[model samples]
Target: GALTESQAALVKSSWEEFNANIPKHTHRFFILVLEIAPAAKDLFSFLKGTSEVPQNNPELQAHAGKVFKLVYEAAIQLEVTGVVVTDATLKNLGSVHVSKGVADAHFPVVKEAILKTIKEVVGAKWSEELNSAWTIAYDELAIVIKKEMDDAA
Candidate 1:
C-alpha cells in the first residue's frame, strides 16, 4: 500500500523535529529493553557480564543511535528507495543478530519498547495517527530484519 499523504506528512514533519535528540530517544528505547529483559544484553559481547551493561555502555549508545538514524532515513526514503532501502539497511544488522543467536521472538519485545519510548519522546505531538505512521514503518523494518536473519541461517 502506498503511504498515505497523512502518514508521510506526519513522519516528515515529526522527523525533522525529532532529529536533534535521536540518540536520547534510542537510548531510552534500549534502556526499556534491558528493563524488560536483562538477558538480552548477553547477545552483545560488550554487554556480556563484564564489558559493562549494554543499556549504559557507550558502545550500545553508539549502536542504537546508528540504528535509529537508519530508521529515520528509511522512513523518509521510502518514497524514493522503497523497500529495498529497508532490506539493504537491515540485512547486516540482522546477520549480526543471527550470529548472536537472537530469536525472532525478540523483535516484538524490542519493538514495543521502542514504540513506548517513541511515544514518550514525542510527547504532546503524538497522536493516534502519528503512532500508526511509525507502526507501519517499524513493522516494515522488522519484517526485513527477520527475513535477513532467516536467510543467514
Candidate 2:
C-alpha cells in the first residue's frame, strides 16, 4: 500500500522542519553509520584516513550536504507521488552501489542511522507514528534498490 495521507503529511512536515540544518544532521548521520559500521568509511574516498566525522570540514560538509539533499528530495517526492524513489534513480543507485562494493547488508544500518539522525534533529516532535511512517518509507526505498542490485547481479 502507498503512504496513508497522514503518513505522507508527517513525512512532509518533519522533513520541512529537518531541512534547516542538513549539514549538521548529515554529519550526525554519517557518524552514527560509521560508529555502527566503521568499514563503511572505506567506501568513500573522501573519508580516507579520517578518524572521525570531521567538524566543519568543507569537503565533508559538501558531501554530507549532497547526501542530505538526496533524502530531502526523496522525502518531498514521497509526499507528492507516494513513491519513495523513481525507477531510474533506483537503477542508478543499484549500479553505483555495486561498483562501490556496497554489500546488500549495508542498507539496514544506513536506514537505522537515518532514523536516528532524524529523531535526534526533530526530538520534541518525534512520535511512534512518525517513526513507523519513516520506517515504512525507508524500507520501501531500500527494497527496490536491493531488488535492482540483485537483478543486476
Whole-structure CA lDDT of model 1: 0.70
What digit string (tens of lDDT, one per residue) describes model 2 on residues 104-150?
A: 88987888888887788778879887887777777766766788887
Give the per-residue lDDT of model 1 (tens digit) for 1-153. 445666667767766665567557666776788888887877877667664443456776777777656655656566455552545656777778877879988888887886787677678989888888777777877777788788877
TM-score of each: 0.81, 0.81
Reference-based lDDT, each prediction: 0.70, 0.74
Q: Which ten residues in a row have the lowest lDDT in candidate 1?
A: 79-88
In model 2, the runs with Cα more than 4 Å from the true position are: 57-59, 65-85
State the lDDT at 112 in candidate 2: 84
